[PDB]
Every structure is written in C-alpha cells, then in structure tokens.
RNA sequence: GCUAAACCUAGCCCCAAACCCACUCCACCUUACUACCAGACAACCUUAGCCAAACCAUUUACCCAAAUAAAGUAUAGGCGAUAGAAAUUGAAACCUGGCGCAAUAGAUAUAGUACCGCAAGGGAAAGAUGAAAAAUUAUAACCAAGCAUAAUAUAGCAAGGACUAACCCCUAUACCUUCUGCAUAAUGAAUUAACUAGAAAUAACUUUGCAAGGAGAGCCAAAGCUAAGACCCCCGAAACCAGACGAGCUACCUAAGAACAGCUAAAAGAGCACACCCGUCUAUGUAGCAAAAUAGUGGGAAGAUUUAUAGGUAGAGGCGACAAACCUA
RNA sequence: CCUCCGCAUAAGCCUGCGUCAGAUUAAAACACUGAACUGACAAUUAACAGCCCAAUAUCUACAAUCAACCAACAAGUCAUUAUUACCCUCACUGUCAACCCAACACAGGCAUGCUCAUAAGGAAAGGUUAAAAAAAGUAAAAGGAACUCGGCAAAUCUUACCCCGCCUGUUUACCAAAAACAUCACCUCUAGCAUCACCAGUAUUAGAGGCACCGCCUGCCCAGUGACACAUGUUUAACGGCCGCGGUACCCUAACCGUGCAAAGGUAGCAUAAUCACUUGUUCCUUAAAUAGGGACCUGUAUGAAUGGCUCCACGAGGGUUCAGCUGUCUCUUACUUUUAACCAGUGAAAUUGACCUGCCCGUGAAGAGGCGGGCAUAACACAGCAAGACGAGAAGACCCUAUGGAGCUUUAAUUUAUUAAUGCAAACAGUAUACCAAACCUGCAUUAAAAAUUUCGGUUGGGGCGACCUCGGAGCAGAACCCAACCUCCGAGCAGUACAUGCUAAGACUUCACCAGUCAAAGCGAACCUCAAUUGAUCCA
C-alpha cells in the first residue's frame, strides 16, 4: 500500500 | 435526531402547504430507501379523495361546478379545484373535464341503473354493467384509495346481492359493498407512459438519485414467472 | 501442574497420575501395560499373560511422577487389608 | 438470563437463552378494598390465590419476599390500614357486612403505628420522615418572652 | 579557564491508630460562570476479551464472608491443560516508624501548567552563595565530554620490543552476536554523567540441635525430624472486546440565500471566453513556500455547477453516479 | 515599476508596529529602532445587526424572469379577518489593529458590494568578480520531427483514417482521472395498500435487479441450482450450456450416409480484433526503406446475438498513424539578462560519524582489500568543478521463504438457529348435536430461505506449488559381532489350509540405538501319550 508516517513535533520548552 | 414531520395541519384548507423533502431519512437518520434525494422544490396540495361528503346542516345531494384545471407535481395526474356551495375542496380531475362543467355528487341508490356522465359520481348500486369507473373505495365512509393515478380506470363485472366486483387495472378481481361511492370515467393526463425523459436532468429535477453502480449477480428471482391469476380478495365482513 | 495457586499458594498434583499409577513407600511406581483388554483375539496367550502383570517404571519416569505429586502421596499408609503391604518396605539392598 | 448449550451437551456451543413467563390479562375483585383491578396475572399467582382461598388472604399471608412487586406491598399496606383504622369500608345502613369482613380478617391486625411503614422503599421512607419532621422554625420572640416571664415569676414569687 | 561539575527541601510509598470533608455576598444546567414566564418523556438488563491447553470450538484463580492443618482430599473437567471446597480442635483488648530514597530516585506534579485535536484524551525538565545581599566582599582553586594556551613534518587498526633523543628498524587483519567459519563490504555504536536487565516450589547438597522420636496443636518416621545456607532475565508486533468522540476537510440529505462580463444567442443539461469548480503535460524542490506549490498548454462556466449559515446518518457500522474511495495530514 | 489588488460586510483569540524609561543582557535570520519586548498611560460612546411579537376561532389556487406581446415546465422565494385586555417608554452586546485556518512573519485556502485600474497598497537588487554546472526568457546560414517508443517545454494555429465509450459529468483527496461508475431507450420480479422516511402516493404507481438511445435482431434448453405452483409442471433479457469418429473423385475448405450421447450439436453477425502461443499471414496502398495505419478471408478447436453482435447524426484532457505549412530534437551549437555561480558581514542547519597518521598493481581470505604477503608510491597545509570506488545517506525489503502470529473476501470446511414469516404440539379464552370449527394478542419444544456468536487452511520438497511419498519387512550400498541414511535399484504386506489344554503359575534374557511396545523359556498343577517375513491401533469414551 501507500506507506507513510507522520512527523512528531517536540514540546515548546526545549 | 430531531426529525419532525411537516404534516402539522389538522384542518382542511385551500392554500398550498409547504412540504419538506426526506431523501430516505426516517426518525433515526440512516438511509433506508435508496434513490430519493435532491430535487426541485414543490408545494403540497391538500387533495380531498372522499367524493361524497355533506356540508354543514346538509344531507341531500348537492351540485358542483368545475372552475379551473391546474397541475399537481406530487403525482402524475393533474388536479382541478371544483367549487360548490360555500366551500372549495380539491378533488382528482377526470378525462374531458374543462372549465364550466357541472358534476353531481349523489348518494340515493335507485331501483334501476343511472346513465350518468363521466364526471359525476354515483354509488355502484346504480351504475350499469360495464362502465369505466375510477377512485373506488373499500369501506363505506372511508375514502377512495384504489385506482387514483393518471388514466387508470376500472370496469364493473357483475353483481350478486349486496356486493360489487370491480375489475382492477392489474387484471385482478376485487369485490366491495354496494353502498360505496365511486367516480365514473377515466382520469385526465393520459399518454403518460409516452412521456420521453430525454436526459438525466429531468430525473434530477424530479428528485431521483441514480441507481447503485455495484454489479449484482442475478439470483433465482430474475427469471420470468408465468403465474395464474391470484384469487379475488374479499373485504365484506361476514359473521 | 501449577507450582503456586491463587488461593493457598501451595503445590497441586495431577489426578491422572494417581488414577493411572500407584506409588510405593520404597520409591517405586506400579503401572499397567496398555492394550491388555482390547483386541485379545489376535494375541498369543503368552502376550496376554505378559500384559496382565504389574510392571514397575524406570528412573526418569519415577522422578517425573514424584515431581508431579506433593508430599501427601509420598507417605506410608497402614491399610487393614492391603495386598501391596509387603511391597512397601524393600529389604536386602546393597547400594 | 442464563445460557443453554446446543444439543444438551457440553461438547458443542454455549448459547444464551432468556425465558419469559406467560401473561394473562385478567380481572380480580378485592373484598377488603371493594374495587376491581386489571392485573396481567400469570399461572403460579393464580394457583397460589386458589390455594390461599381468595386474593386478600394471598396478599396478607405472603411476606415481602414472596410478592416481588410494589403493587402487592401497596395492597398489603392498604388492607392493613383499613383493618387497623376501622374506617368505614362500604357505607352505612348495613354495618353487618363490614363487621363480617372485619371478623373474617382478624388473625393479623397490625397496629396503626407499624402498618404505615410496610412496603415503603428507602427514598419514600426518608421523604415521609422528612415530611413528619418538617416543622417551620418557630420565631425566637415567643421563646424570649416565655423565658422572660418565667424569670420574672421566679424572681417575684420568691 | 571558558563551557560547566557536587552542595537539601517541597516531600514522595507502605504500616499501627483514627472512620474524612464539603455556602463570606452574587452567578452555575439556555451560548454553566446568563435575575425574571404555560406540556410535565428521561435509571431499574447474563459483562466481554487476551492467554494457556503448543491451534481451537468444552475449560482457564479474578467471584470482595480474616489465619492454619485437613488439602491441593473427595470431586468437576475434548477425565486434560487445569479448577477446587465442606464436616472438624482452633483465631490474647491499649503503645507515634522505615537495616526506603533525596529532583533521570521516590506520586506525573512547584502541575494535571505549557503544547496537540472541534472533540474524549495525551501530557513533560524547574528550586543550590551566605549568621548578617540593609556583607554586590574578592576570591579558594584543582577532575569528564568541546575549544585556544601549544596546528601539520614520509609509512600506514594507530600497538608492542627497544636505544642518549617523537619519526626512521622489525612484528602484528577493532569490539559483542545469530554463524563450522565475520574487521570483513552482516548486525549496534560520537562521547560524557544518571538508570536499566536471574524474582521462585517438590525433589536434591552442606552445617547446628534433638532422637525411635522430631516439630510452638495440624505433618513425617523399619534412623528419623527441625532450622539455616544454596536457584532459575530484560526490551521489542500485527490482532479482539467493553465505556465514551467525531460529517466545521471529505460521501449523502434538509430550510432559507448568493454567484455567473462579453460575443455567437438555431429552441438547447449549445460553443469561445472574466471572475469561479477540478487539475492531462512540461520545467523547478523532495529536510522544499507547502507532511502535495508555482504559468500555460487544459474540461465546464444558465446548470447532473459552485458557495456563506444551521441540523442529521459512526465502526457486529455511516455513506457510496462502486474508487473496498472517504469517516480530522 | 507592479496592481491577479485594496476598502467594507461574513467567520475568528481579543489589545497584538501610539507615547514614556530600559534599550547593559535578551527575540530582528545584520543595523537604525521595532509587526518575533518588560512595566505604566487608554482607545472603541450608535442611529449599524441583534436583544422580539397577549390570546380565542377563522381567511390566503391565477409565480419570478423590466412583466406589458408571445411562449412554457423543474408547477414556484413573501398578503388577513371578528372579539377581549393593554395610553409606563429608548435599557443591553462590539465598533482599535498590520488580524483567520495550516507547529512559522509560508509562492496554500476563504463567502458578497464597490472603480475591473483607479483617489487602496508595496519594492525582483547588501556589496564585490563574471569560475564551471543547473533553472527561467529573445533568435539564428541549409533540411523542418530525418533525435527520442511515442509532436516531450516551445511557436505556427492544424486535415483525414481506426478502436472504445451514445453525449454533459464523475471516480482512485496524496504516483493510474481511464475503455472505469452513472445517464434517457429496453427487459425481469414483487405489492390490493392510510399515517414517523417509503407515501400525506395508489398496479399508466412504488420497491428490488441486468445492459444502456435512435437502425437490423435476441434462435434452443429445467438433465444440475434457485424461484413459483405442490396438478411432476412453468421460469433462463434467472445461475449456465449449443459434439466426435468412419466412408467419403484429381488438393485444402466437403455435398451426403452410418454410429453413441445429450437441452441444441455455433443461429445471424464480425474479426487474425483490447481477443491463448503458432501470427513479421495471402495481397494492395501510404515511406526509396514500415511486427507502425486502412481495405476483402477464417483451423475463432479459446469471438459471438441485453457477460448483447455491427455500421450510423454529434462528441471525448481515452488509445494509435498521416497530408499542405512550422519549432535548434540533431548534424553543430551559439550571441545576451535574471535566479544562480566565486569572495566579503552575521543567524545558521539536516542526514551521517567505531577510531584514521586515509595511494597503486599482482596474489589470498566470509568468495569484489587504502589497513594481509611481495613490489611500485611519499615534505606538509586550503580554495574552485565532474562522478570511478568507500557493495555511501533515508525506509529491521513492498519481490522469494518460515511462523500451529493476524486480517479482508467467498462457501456445497466445522458447532448451532441465538432474531423473522410459515408450520405441528401443550396451557389461555367462547359458543357447539358420541364429531368438527382453534379468531386478535403473550409462553416453551423441533424444522425450512437471511444473518450470524468462533476457527483453521499438515509435513520433506538441493528456494515454494505442480512431479513423488506419509506404517512395516527383505535383497546390495553397510562384504566376516552389532548400528547407520538418501527424492539410490527392485519384491511385498492391512492375510491365510486344519485341531481351541490358542489352560493357570513361575527362574533366567534379547529388546529396532530413550520410553511407550514385542519375543524365547527352566519347573509345577492340570492332557492325551501350531506353519509363514511385514501381516497393524495406545489414552478418553461407548
Ligand atoms: Mg435502473
Ligand atoms: Mg450496474
Ligand atoms: Mg492457546
Ligand atoms: Mg470450614
Ligand atoms: Mg521527578
Ligand atoms: Mg516525571
Ligand atoms: Mg577536560
Ligand atoms: Mg611499518
Ligand atoms: Mg559484553
Ligand atoms: Mg540477528
Ligand atoms: Mg551464513
Ligand atoms: Mg562492519
Ligand atoms: Mg542479519
Ligand atoms: Mg551505522
Ligand atoms: Mg455538512
Ligand atoms: Mg459523489
Ligand atoms: Mg452549456
Ligand atoms: Mg464551455
Ligand atoms: Mg471494481
Ligand atoms: Mg472598524
Ligand atoms: Mg505546514
Ligand atoms: Mg500608493
Ligand atoms: Mg546577493
Ligand atoms: Mg535555425
Ligand atoms: Mg523517429
Ligand atoms: Mg505540446
Ligand atoms: Mg465517456
Ligand atoms: Mg490520483
Ligand atoms: Mg476529486
Ligand atoms: Mg492525475
Ligand atoms: Mg458502463
Ligand atoms: Mg439470448
Ligand atoms: Mg492471438
Ligand atoms: Mg513514428
Ligand atoms: Mg468529459
Ligand atoms: Mg559568509
Ligand atoms: Mg581470517
Ligand atoms: Mg583485489
Ligand atoms: Mg572498509
Ligand atoms: Mg527483515
Ligand atoms: Mg510448526
Ligand atoms: Mg494461527
Ligand atoms: Mg488466535
Ligand atoms: Mg476481524
Ligand atoms: Mg512446507
Ligand atoms: Mg524443489
Ligand atoms: Mg533397547
Ligand atoms: Mg514345561
């Protein structure tokens, strides 16, 4: 199939 | 699902009441009848199907007068408002009914038959054998339900002693009590099957979605069934 | 065999071992040869007599049957009319 | 709401089956209350009524763990109150019938202070206890003038 | 010596005891944080499932009545992996701590804060001088990974043997593993600091004590009984059920509105063509403007067209002009 | 210089480039000081849209489109009456902005009015040189598609032929936008009918299905399935199917006859086609050169008449070819501008890294060596371009195989009808002269069509399926005690011809490399005086 992974955003504290 | 019906009028009137389309949505909201949805806005007319009805402080027969023949989008046949007395009620029009006509709504059954026209209405007990009738009832004082489309008509077969067998357009026999009022003649707006559609725009305007695109394999019910005529259903209650 | 139960936390036994074997106090298990009651018309009388004998087990089999049981089945019973009473104690043993 | 196997064997499929009792909408006649009621009675209830020789006996003899219904407890409490308060059941001009009815049901006679709390639930009992223990707050002016007159009488009579 | 390293207290877990609480005035069931108007309908229901029996369809402690021996005994159980009582002697009221810890440990918590989605929900690091900061003083410095101080000097898994001196002379194919055989061009790795991975029964071995008896009721015994020591890992999937959430993007429907210059207008679900609906191809980028863009060549553009507002159809399903297409990347 | 923009309304957190001090530090991709700031000062005042309507009964069929001719069909967006009671009156929500949804100050998206370019609004360029490479723009001596599978950006403006689909349209949001799904025409089946969609409808109607107009037509079948009658039958435009051989004159393709089967032994049509391999078919044309394209043939043994067969009026971002004229795709590339390229000023990554003091050849190794042997090679350190290698970077490969790890689809693979309609029985009502009738609504048992509550899909297979096998014995491999395998080559066995002392106990051994199993036998009581080589079946339960 059409394999795809969504990106993950880090918290806005670093 | 706040689904409320638009049939909120317990009094008969003449002004066309606005109706709301459904598209196959019941009280839950799921589509249960496919092929309905998206059409041109229409207005509902309160059509009085009961032919003979006495007015206030009335009992005997009364005369009527056809005024103007219009059209009803809720059905195939056309309607025509017929005035008479001190009230006006919508009834189903018949063939060869124009402006300035005179019709009779009688009820007294006579000894012999009555050579009525194709506009007036009389009980089945005073009609000759072999007469094209329409809008036949099932119970005395119930209302016309059978044979009400465009051009449909029935012919009287025979009489026994208190019943009246009426030949239905489906080639099926059906008897009814003698004290039932039925109209005489054929319904207007003939040649309805010859109406060429032309394009899908007409079907979309009428409010009919296209059929499903899934290829269904025909089972065992797709073959031709050469079956005999079903027996005559009786509505006369016998003790 | 459930080494630790959920109510008492003890050790459970296998009732099949008790119903199919018989442990003696010396450390031997008495069993029965299978097929001693089925299809006896095609077997020689010598085989029929051999199948109807109390045969002892081996070492690994006895160890397995002991591990499948607890300390209750490894005691010494003193029945009134025990036909296997003379087989509990084993004399004349030199390593 | 139980479970039933297939062909009455545990080596098949465990299906679920719920039995329903039979309901016969009949009509009775209570002698203590003198009023007919339409109750969808079953068969075991009719058998118990026939064995108890009437409906009033079946209602008054069976305890709360046998009726399994609120209407039964209400009828029991009503009959107990009618037998305790000695209220005129029918009407005057013929007290012999009422006397015979009261004499027929004399092997119980629960007092009035205990028959009013028969069949009531917890919420109804709490509501009744709150209504009995309502009492609008009495103004403190009456208590103050009572204490004042008591004090003046005590200091004057001495 | 710059970067940066340690400085204990909010307290955190379980015991014994004790049963623990909820309006200062206003607002809180409609668009909660809204002072003020005419259909009163709203609960009373076998939980299921995973695993195990090397599959799995019977079965699988979890059921909320104090210990123990009976006893894992009779029993139930594709009589098999397992489950499991009862009858019976019996069950000494009252005392304020940690052979646990100190911010990567201990509750996630200074806090259910920021942040993500319309929504249920998920959810993380924080604070170090001092008696006198109303002592802004002069000091206390010294250790890891990164740097200058103080770059390179021919030759070679960075190493060893060595001489008066770094190289020059000789030898020598990184580390753990599935593998007979691995540095192989197979797998893992940039370092430092903190954390992380062998928990336990019947039967066995050794050493005290007593002894035909041992043992603080119950159990065993033709040299036995009691006690102690000794022992059996971690992390990583697709699947199923139960309780709640979504049609604001997209599929369909409903009620009230808006949009389409100009020319040819053959009467038209006509043509070209603005704005508008979708995107057949070229070129640019794939950590870009963008988790799907840029101009034309494109089809439609008086209707089977598009759109602002409000409502409904949801998983044992919704919808479907049928792509197994869509249901918040 | 642009304006493909701006101003308002609609939706949206509400204070988000006004002043003051700090501007030493902190966010501007660098600075001034300010659209990525700390504290204090206060903007917006309604007439704009809302915040709405006292009841009892009754009334409202001649559209809009300048609505006046005409003409319709999709049959349509706007109105009151009689009675009772009511003369207190201007309160409330916002009027700022450079602003919303996408993690952002993003070349993305947003509904209507206004002049469709103006009176709204902004700057492609930081500087230095003109490296190579790449992208966007003008044209070129001769050929104008001769390069490429194909007219693939590009400008001239372009005709005819074939297939497919009637057309418009829509579908795989994000690699296929199509011949794919739909559309009017046609055909089949079901239903005698009143309140919640179907339908406020009536057998010219409604629902369930197959192709999809107009022209020629749809020839056969209930042996098998289902459906309808339970009359043994009907149904196929319901699931599906319409032969083979021999005799057959000179040559294929046969006229005809015989034979066996069955519902008929391919009807019409069309084509070497979107059509199994033979197939680059005979042949004509388009080119000088043509498995490209069109025309007449079916041995098409596998096309075929609603799984519909073919021309035809119009059309297609669907798939292929060509004619008159032209485009640097090429022979053979070139002249300029911008992005970009090289240096200066700063913010400043991502993937990736065992350490490197890192050259080549021959040969070897886990089979492709810069680190191993022998040779060749060698002062050190940066900048500017290309890819030959370091089996270089991104995804525990989507292709092959294993898994008693899953999921989707379809059943004539397994437990069962848990929910309908039909049935038969039992209780529940009421009449009825030793007999019949069993109405409307509840309960339990068993059956028939739809759903379903669950599951698995054995093993070796010189990679897997197909080929072959699934237990045991013998002959050589294994030669003279014993054991030893192959998908190495051969015979077989699932029994038998005759008496039941083919009775009961009891020392000692072999043991198919373990166990479960099998076999011989001293002696006694009892009695007159056993053959063959494998020749077979355990637990539970009955
Ligand atoms: Mg159709
Ligand atoms: Mg279809
Ligand atoms: Mg399992
Ligand atoms: Mg007990
Ligand atoms: Mg912490
Ligand atoms: Mg934490
Ligand atoms: Mg250091
Ligand atoms: Mg060297
Ligand atoms: Mg290690
Ligand atoms: Mg591995
Ligand atoms: Mg290998
Ligand atoms: Mg390696
Ligand atoms: Mg590997
Ligand atoms: Mg690596
Ligand atoms: Mg919507
Ligand atoms: Mg659609
Ligand atoms: Mg058009
Ligand atoms: Mg157009
Ligand atoms: Mg499909
Ligand atoms: Mg404003
Ligand atoms: Mg984004
Ligand atoms: Mg300006
Ligand atoms: Mg520049
Ligand atoms: Mg040129
Ligand atoms: Mg060419
Ligand atoms: Mg082109
Ligand atoms: Mg098309
Ligand atoms: Mg696509
Ligand atoms: Mg689309
Ligand atoms: Mg596309
Ligand atoms: Mg089609
Ligand atoms: Mg046919
Ligand atoms: Mg072919
Ligand atoms: Mg060509
Ligand atoms: Mg199109
Ligand atoms: Mg620079
Ligand atoms: Mg080696
Ligand atoms: Mg080499
Ligand atoms: Mg290497
Ligand atoms: Mg792998
Ligand atoms: Mg296996
Ligand atoms: Mg499995
Ligand atoms: Mg499973
Ligand atoms: Mg599933
Ligand atoms: Mg296999
Ligand atoms: Mg093979
Ligand atoms: Mg052996
Ligand atoms: Mg002998």
UniProtKB/Swiss-Prot annotation, chain A:
Location(s), subcellular: Mitochondrion
Domain of life: Eukaryota
Annotated family: Belongs to the mitochondrion-specific ribosomal protein mL45 family.
Function noted in UniProt: Component of the mitochondrial large ribosomal subunit (mt-LSU). Within the mitochondrial ribosomes, required to direct the nascent polypeptide toward the tunnel exit and position the exit at a distance from the membrane surface.
Subunit composition and interactions: Component of the mitochondrial large ribosomal subunit (mt-LSU). Mature mammalian 55S mitochondrial ribosomes consist of a small (28S) and a large (39S) subunit. The 28S small subunit contains a 12S ribosomal RNA (12S mt-rRNA) and 30 different proteins. The 39S large subunit contains a 16S rRNA (16S mt-rRNA), a copy of mitochondrial valine transfer RNA (mt-tRNA(Val)), which plays an integral structural role, and 52 different proteins.
Name used for this protein in its record: Large ribosomal subunit protein mL45
Swiss-Prot record, chain B:
Compartment list: Mitochondrion
GO biological process: mitochondrial translation
Main location: mitochondrion
Molecular function GO terms recorded: RNA binding; structural constituent of ribosome
One GO CC term on file: mitochondrion
Family that this chain belongs to: Belongs to the universal ribosomal protein uL2 family.
Subunit field text: Component of the mitochondrial large ribosomal subunit (mt-LSU). Mature mammalian 55S mitochondrial ribosomes consist of a small (28S) and a large (39S) subunit. The 28S small subunit contains a 12S ribosomal RNA (12S mt-rRNA) and 30 different proteins. The 39S large subunit contains a 16S rRNA (16S mt-rRNA), a copy of mitochondrial valine transfer RNA (mt-tRNA(Val)), which plays an integral structural role, and 52 different proteins.
Protein name (record): Large ribosomal subunit protein uL2m
Residues of the full protein shown: 61 to 299 of 305
Swiss-Prot record, chain C:
The protein's assembly and partners: Component of the mitochondrial large ribosomal subunit (mt-LSU). Mature mammalian 55S mitochondrial ribosomes consist of a small (28S) and a large (39S) subunit. The 28S small subunit contains a 12S ribosomal RNA (12S mt-rRNA) and 30 different proteins. The 39S large subunit contains a 16S rRNA (16S mt-rRNA), a copy of mitochondrial valine transfer RNA (mt-tRNA(Val)), which plays an integral structural role, and 52 different proteins.
Protein's name in the database: Large ribosomal subunit protein bL35m
Protein's UniProt keywords contain Transcription regulation: no
Keyword set, alphabetical order: Mitochondrion, Ribonucleoprotein, Ribosomal protein, Transit peptide
Name of the gene this protein is made from: MRPL35
A biological process term (GO) from this entry: mitochondrial translation
Keyword Protein transport tagged: no
GO molecular function, one term: structural constituent of ribosome
Domain of life from the UniProt record: Eukaryota
Subcellular localization: Mitochondrion
Organism of origin: Homo sapiens
Residues in the signal sequence: none
Included range, full protein: 94 to 188 of 188
GO terms for cellular component: mitochondrial inner membrane; mitochondrial large ribosomal subunit; mitochondrial ribosome; mitochondrion
Transmembrane portions of the chain: none
Family per record: Belongs to the bacterial ribosomal protein bL35 family.
UniProtKB/Swiss-Prot annotation, chain D:
UniProt key word Coiled coil: no
UniProt KW keywords: Mitochondrion, Ribonucleoprotein, Ribosomal protein, Transit peptide
GO cellular component entries: cytosol; mitochondrial inner membrane; mitochondrial large ribosomal subunit; mitochondrial ribosome; mitochondrion
A single GO molecular function term of this UniProt record: structural constituent of ribosome
Location(s) in or outside the cell: Mitochondrion
Highest rank taxon of the organism: Eukaryota
Tissue: Found in a variety of normal tissues including spleen, testes, thymus, liver, kidney, brain, adrenal, lung and retinal tissue.
GO biological process, one term: mitochondrial translation
Main location: mitochondrion
Additional facts recorded: Potentially represents an important therapeutic reagent for HLA-A24 patients. This antigen is recognized by tumor-infiltrating lymphocyte (TIL) 1290 in the context of HLA-A24.
Subunit annotation: Component of the mitochondrial large ribosomal subunit (mt-LSU). Mature mammalian 55S mitochondrial ribosomes consist of a small (28S) and a large (39S) subunit. The 28S small subunit contains a 12S ribosomal RNA (12S mt-rRNA) and 30 different proteins. The 39S large subunit contains a 16S rRNA (16S mt-rRNA), a copy of mitochondrial valine transfer RNA (mt-tRNA(Val)), which plays an integral structural role, and 52 different proteins. Interacts with OXA1L.
Family, similarity comment: Belongs to the bacterial ribosomal protein bL28 family.
Protein name in the entry: Large ribosomal subunit protein bL28m
The organism of origin for this protein: Homo sapiens (Human)
Gene: MRPL28
Full protein stretch here: 87 to 244 of 256
């Amino acid at each position: 199939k059409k394999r795809f992974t969504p990106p993950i955003y880090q918290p806005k504290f670093k | 699902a706040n689904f409320v019906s638009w049939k909120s009028r317990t009094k008969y009137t003449i002004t066309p009441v606005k109706m709301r389309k459904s598209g196959g949505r019941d009280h839950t909201g799921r589509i249960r009848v496919h092929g309905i949805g998206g059409g041109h806005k229409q207005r509902y007319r309160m059509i009085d199907f009961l032919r003979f009805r006495p007015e206030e402080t009335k009992s005997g027969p009364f005369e009527e007068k056809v005024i103007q023949v219009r059209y009803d989008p809720c059905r195939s046949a056309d309607i025509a408002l017929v005035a008479g007395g001190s009230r006006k009620r919508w009834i189903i029009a018949t063939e060869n009914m124009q402006a300035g006509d005179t019709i009779l709504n009688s009820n007294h059954i006579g000894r012999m038959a009555v050579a009525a026209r194709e506009g007036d209405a009389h009980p089945l007990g005073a009609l000759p054998v072999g007469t094209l009738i329409n809008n036949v009832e099932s119970e005395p004082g119930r209302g016309a339900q059978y044979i009400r489309a465009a051009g449909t008509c029935g012919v009287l077969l025979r009489k026994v002693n208190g019943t009246a067998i009426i030949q239905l357009p489906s080639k099926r026999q059906m008897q009814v009590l003698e004290t039932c009022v039925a109209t005489v003649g054929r319904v207007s707006n003939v040649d309805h099957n010859k109406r060429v559609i032309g394009k899908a725009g007409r079907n979309r305007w009428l409010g009919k979605r296209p059929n499903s695109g899934r290829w269904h394999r025909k089972g065992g019910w797709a073959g031709r069934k050469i079956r005999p005529l079903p027996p005559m259903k009786s509505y006369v209650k016998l003790p | 065999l459930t080494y630790f139960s959920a109510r008492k936390g003890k050790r459970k036994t296998v009732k099949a071992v008790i119903d199919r074997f018989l442990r003696l106090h010396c450390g031997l298990w008495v069993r029965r040869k299978a097929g001693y009651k089925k299809k006896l018309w095609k077997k020689t009388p010598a085989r029929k007599k051999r199948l109807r004998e109390f045969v002892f087990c081996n070492k690994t089999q006895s160890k397995l049957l002991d591990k499948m049981t607890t300390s209750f089945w490894k005691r010494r019973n003193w029945y009134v009319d025990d036909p296997y009473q003379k087989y509990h104690d084993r004399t004349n043993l030199k390593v | 709401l139980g479970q039933i196997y297939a062909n009455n064997d545990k080596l098949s499929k465990r299906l679920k089956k719920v039995w329903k009792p039979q309901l016969f909408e009949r009509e009775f006649y209570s002698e203590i209350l003198d009023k007919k009621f339409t109750v969808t009675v079953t068969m075991r209830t009719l058998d118990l009524i026939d064995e108890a020789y009437g409906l009033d006996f079946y209602i008054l003899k069976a305890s709360g763990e046998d009726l399994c219904s609120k209407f039964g407890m209400d009828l029991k409490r009503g009959m107990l109150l009618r037998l305790a308060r000695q209220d005129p059941q029918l009407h005057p001009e013929d007290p012999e019938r009422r006397a015979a009815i009261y004499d027929k049901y004399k092997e119980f006679a629960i007092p009035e202070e205990e028959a009013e709390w028969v069949g009531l639930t917890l919420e109804e009992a709490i509501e009744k206890q709150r209504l009995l223990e309502e009492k609008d707050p009495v103004p403190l002016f009456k208590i103050y003038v009572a204490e004042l007159i008591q004090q003046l009488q005590q200091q004057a009579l001495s």
